[PDB]
Amino acid sequence: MGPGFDFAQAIMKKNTVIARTEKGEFTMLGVYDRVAVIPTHASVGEIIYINDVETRVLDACALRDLTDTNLEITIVKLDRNQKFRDIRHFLPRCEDDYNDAVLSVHTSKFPNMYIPVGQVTNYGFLNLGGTPTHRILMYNFPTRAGQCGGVVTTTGKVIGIHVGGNGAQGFAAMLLHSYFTD
Numbered sequence: 051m052g053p054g055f056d057f058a059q060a061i062m063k064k065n066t067v068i069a070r071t072e073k074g075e076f077t078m079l080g081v082y083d084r085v086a087v088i089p090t091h092a093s094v095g096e097i098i099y100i101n102d103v104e105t106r107v108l109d110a111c112a113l114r115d116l117t118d119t120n121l122e123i124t125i126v127k128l129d130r131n132q133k134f135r136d137i138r139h140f141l142p143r144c145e146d147d148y149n150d151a152v153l154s155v156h157t158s159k160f161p162n163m164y165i166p167v168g169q170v171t172n173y174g175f176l177n178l179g180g181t182p183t184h185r186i187l188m189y190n191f192p193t194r195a196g197q198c199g200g201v202v203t204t205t206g207k208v209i210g211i212h213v214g215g216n217g218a219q220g221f222a223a224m225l226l227h228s229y230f231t232d
């Protein structure tokens with residue numbers, strides 16, 4: 051409907067896939083080449099389904115800050131026959147707060163969904179389903195089961211991936227440019 055949705059739509063159409071693990075279906079953001087991100091609670095194994103295609107996982111690391119605290123981001127390298135559009139130039143370099151964000155989701159259950167979540171706080175520390183977690187972004191929208199992995203964007207920036215909520219607020223793990231230097 052406007053410039054926020056236009057940026058979000060561009061990321062969803064070219065840079066997302068449907069990832070299925072033994073823990074369910076997730077929005078998965080492709081970042082560059084065969085490299086994508088997914089919430090660590092997806093529990094990525096040796097084999098993952100990508101748009102219902104059986105895919106070998108070539109390498110996978112969980113992201114953790116230098117305090118040895120969970121960031122809730124898993125980076126995955128897929129044995130896929132096609133590269134993603136490189137979107138690393140849309141990743142912020144530093145922790146920040148934001149105006150006017152959209153949360154975008156694409157699953158079997160929630161196809162082509164775009165939520166205007168408004169203002170995004172650099173919240174920092176969150177106890178996330180019992181796990182101390184750093185670099186959390188917070189927005190005042192009552193997000194639900196099915197939205198994990200959902201991509202959080204502003205006009206010009208891909209800022210995070212949705213990892214939880216409490217029924218009043220939603221929470222996203224920051225994406226930073228330094229996670230994806232090759």
Ligand SMILES: Cc1nnc2n1CCNC2
Pocket residue numbers: 085109110111125126127229230
């Ligand atoms: C690409 C990339 N960046 N960090 C990681 N990877 C794939 C292997 N695991 C960790």
